[PDB]
């Protein structure tokens, strides 16, 4: 409940984490009673000996999807798209009779029917991408099962912006980042910010995300710990956004579209009821579970955002591990960015500890 007690909690938790996990650098933000608190440890660049700072850019990985979803939300609020619109209405070259009956909703929530996790790295232009989606054969009926995938929500992000007349990067920059004043959040890191761009570390070597089709939509975002705290404050309490389309899209990103056990699938965001049991999110965060194919029960109409929720997303790249969580009712939140990927269960357990102490 003080500036120093928060520090003590966060340190007691993070110091052993970095120690036993071999994390060169971490940056962590804690929103407590609406105010943000920031913490840094370690190096962003070992060779050049650069310390981690509140300006250091980390690769977010899958967390980028939360920016995808909200943008989609925004595009919904603008009247440009409806989640009930068929996928083929925005990419009419997808003529396969298996795509008949797949709507933007299903792409957004990984319920298309088993769309593959990753776009094959050999799919390097949008022609190969069209062929790839054309020859995909569904495992299930739309709406029957949830299979977490980059291809699905990536295509959702790519198609949601089509009516905008802008590219995904451009539309995001204009309709999300700039209105919310995230001047340290990038799909493409400009060369003059490259000293703040931490290096990820995979078995000792320094790495950055490799470009891929739809990388911006699924896993290509990089940001500082302050920009991420602002992102969490905006999604946690969006009443202070002047842009009503964005206000609304943020609300829709946390709408509850499907029920998977005790988890509710938003647009990118993933929600559980607060209070909750750690084991749920901890065990579920494991890549063996979070990537599984799980039966989904439709929620129609989608339940509006629930304030008594634990809203979160994990995301990792070759050399980075990142986790975001917040409880709107409690006005509480945590951002964790590390230039080294470590098991999502450990990440979530640490975040849970910290936030449980601070409630």
């Amino acid at each position: 409940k003080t500036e120093q007690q928060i520090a003590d909690i966060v340190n007691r938790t993070i110091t052993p984490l970095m120690q036993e996990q071999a994390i060169p650098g971490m940056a962590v933000a804690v929103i407590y009673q609406g105010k943000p608190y920031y913490f840094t440890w370690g190096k962003a660049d070992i060779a050049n000996n650069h310390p981690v700072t509140q300006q250091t850019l980390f690769e977010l990985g899958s967390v980028s999807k939360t920016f995808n979803g909200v943008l989609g939300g925004d595009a919904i609020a603008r009247g440009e798209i409806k989640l009930s619109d068929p996928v083929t209405k925005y990419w009419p070259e997808l003529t396969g009779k298996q795509w008949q009956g797949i709507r933007l909703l299903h792409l957004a929530t990984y319920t298309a029917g088993g769309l593959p996790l990753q776009i094959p790295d050999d799919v390097r232009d949008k022609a190969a991408l069209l062929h790839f989606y054309q020859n995909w054969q569904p495992q299930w009926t739309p709406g029957a099962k949830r299979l977490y995938a980059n291809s699905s929500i990536g295509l959702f992000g790519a198609l949601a912006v089509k009516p905008s007349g802008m590219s995904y990067e451009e539309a995001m920059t204009r309709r999300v980042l700039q209105p919310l004043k995230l001047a340290h959040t990038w799909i493409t890191v400009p060369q003059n910010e490259q000293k703040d761009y931490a290096w990820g570390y995979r078995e000792g070597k320094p790495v950055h995300v490799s470009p891929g089709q739809l990388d911006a939509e699924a896993y290509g975002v990089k940001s500082s710990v302050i920009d991420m705290a602002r992102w969490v404050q905006a999604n946690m309490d969006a009443s202070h956004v002047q842009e009503k389309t964005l206000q609304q899209g943020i609300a829709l990103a946390q709408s509850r579209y499907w029920r998977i056990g005790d988890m509710y699938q938003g647009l990118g965001w993933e929600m559980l009821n607060w209070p909750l049991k750690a084991d749920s999110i901890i065990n579920g965060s494991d890549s063996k579970v979070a990537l599984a194919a799980l039966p989904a029960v439709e929620v129609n109409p989608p339940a509006p955002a629930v304030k008594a929720s634990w809203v979160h997303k994990t995301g990792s790249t070759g050399g980075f591990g990142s986790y975001v969580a917040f409880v709107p009712e409690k006005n509480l939140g945590i951002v964790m960015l590390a230039n080294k990927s470590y098991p999502n269960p450990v990440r979530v357990e640490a975040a849970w500890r910290i936030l449980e102490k601070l409630q």
Epitope: G114, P116, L117, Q118, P120, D121, Q139, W140, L147, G261, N283, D286, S287, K288, V289, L291, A292, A293, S341, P343, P345
Partner: nanobody
Framework: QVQLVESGGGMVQPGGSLRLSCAAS????????MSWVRRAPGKGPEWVST????????SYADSVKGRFTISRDNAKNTLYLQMNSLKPEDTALYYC??????????????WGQGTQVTVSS
């Protein structure tokens, strides 16, 4: 933490038998459908079999239908795969995992260490 620990692999002559075990820990094993997947030398992954939560549903790939029998013991949190009338075509590394369906390409920190099965003269 969610660990799956394969075992039962070994070297055998064609026609023999071999029971693979997969001991799970760190999660509610009885809540999830479990799959056996295999990876051949040089070749990519390949789905072998799947078994639903209650164990009343089983599903096999054409290559092994009729010869294998997947099962589970949710009391002792253990998946099993009985393999009968093996062929040199079944020589590969075997993993258990939570069911994703059929496709298992482009996989991250994920696979356990599996256990190898080898069938030849």
């Amino acid at each position: 933490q969610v660990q799956l620990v394969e075992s039962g692999g070994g070297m055998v002559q064609p026609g023999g038998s071999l029971r693979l075990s997969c001991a799970a820990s760190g999660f509610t094993f009885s809540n999830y459908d479990m799959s056996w997947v295999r990876r051949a030398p040089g070749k990519g992954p390949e789905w072998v079999s799947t078994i639903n939560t209650g164990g009343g549903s089983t599903s096999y790939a054409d290559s092994v239908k009729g010869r294998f029998t997947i099962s589970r013991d949710n009391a002792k949190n253990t998946l099993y795969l009985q393999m009968n009338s093996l062929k040199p075509e079944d020589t590969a590394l075997y993993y258990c995992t939570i069911d994703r369906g059929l496709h298992y390409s482009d996989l991250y920190d994920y696979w356990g260490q599996g256990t190898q099965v080898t069938v030849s003269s």
